[PDB]
Amino acid sequence: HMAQVTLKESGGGSVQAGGSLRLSCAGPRHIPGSVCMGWYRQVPGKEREGVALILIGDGHTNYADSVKGRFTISQDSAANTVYLQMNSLKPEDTAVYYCAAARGLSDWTCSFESGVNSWGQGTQVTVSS
Amino acid sequence: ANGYKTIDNKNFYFRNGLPQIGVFKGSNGFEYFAPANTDANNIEGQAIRYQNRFLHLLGKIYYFGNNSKAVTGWQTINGKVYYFMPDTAMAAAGGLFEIDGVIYFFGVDGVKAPGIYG
């Protein structure tokens, strides 16, 4: 079983179209089993969507098509912590970004589907025209 | 006179009628039966509190969780993947290991290399 973990978030901010921002999300130092960490985003009024996940300690990445080639997810090389480098920001990227942790799939991949175990409280990112 | 014993509310793991030092599985999971004066004046071979940390013992590597018991199986610790062998709790280390029919590489420090090796 995957116990719930606390996910502490930092970063975000407000930029003009075209800018760059970074998010960070830290989990506890020890998580049994395999773990995918990363972000989903939700605009108030809209549905939540996956943004990017990475499998900690192995490195499979999964990106939403709408952010591929602009946002990059990486992990810290000494902690259960991930980073989202949000380059080339567009107004449509404006949302609350929520850190997520979920079990890795048996083939060492992460999916946005089939359940998230733990959530962060969320970070607002705002991009203006 | 062999095996796990509870004496005066302390736990020991006996062989040859003497407390052994090491990480052994008693009725209460894998515990660290430590040399005297490792923690809080424990006596020789007494199981000690030893939590949320690695243990290096005779060139083997263990990880103790929040209940002073050594973990087993896949574990994600400090950004890295480890696999602690179920029957010993020792980290897989030093080369190729076949786990559930898949081959992986683990470094000398027990860290799993990215990817599948066979």
| Intertermini distance of chain A | 45 Å
State the domain count of chain B: 1
Using DSSP, what is the number of strands of chain A? 12
Cα shape of chain A? globular
Radius of gyration of chain A: 14 Å
Count of spatially separate domains of chain A: 1
Cell wall-binding repeats (chain B): 1-20, 51-70, 71-90, 93-112
Organism (chain B): Clostridioides difficile (Peptoclostridium difficile)
Protein name (chain B): Toxin A
Binding site for alpha-D-galactosyl-(1->3)-beta-D-galactosyl-(1->4)-N-acetyl-beta-D-glucosamine 2 (chain B): 39, 46-49, 66-69
Describe this structure in words.
The complex is a heterodimer of chains A (129) and B (118). Helices cover 0% and strands 49% of the residues of chain A. Chain A contains no helices and twelve strands. Chain B has 118 residues and is mainly beta. The radius of gyration of chain B is 16 Å and the shape is elongated. In chain B, strand 6 and strand 7 form a beta hairpin. At the A-B interface, strand 4 of A face strand 8 of B. Chain B: Cell wall-binding repeats lie at residues 1-20, 51-70, 71-90, 93-112. Chain B: Alpha-D-galactosyl-(1->3)-beta-D-galactosyl-(1->4)-N-acetyl-beta-D-glucosamine 2 binds at residues 39, 46-49, 66-69. Chain B: Belongs to the clostridial glucosylating toxin (LCGT) family.
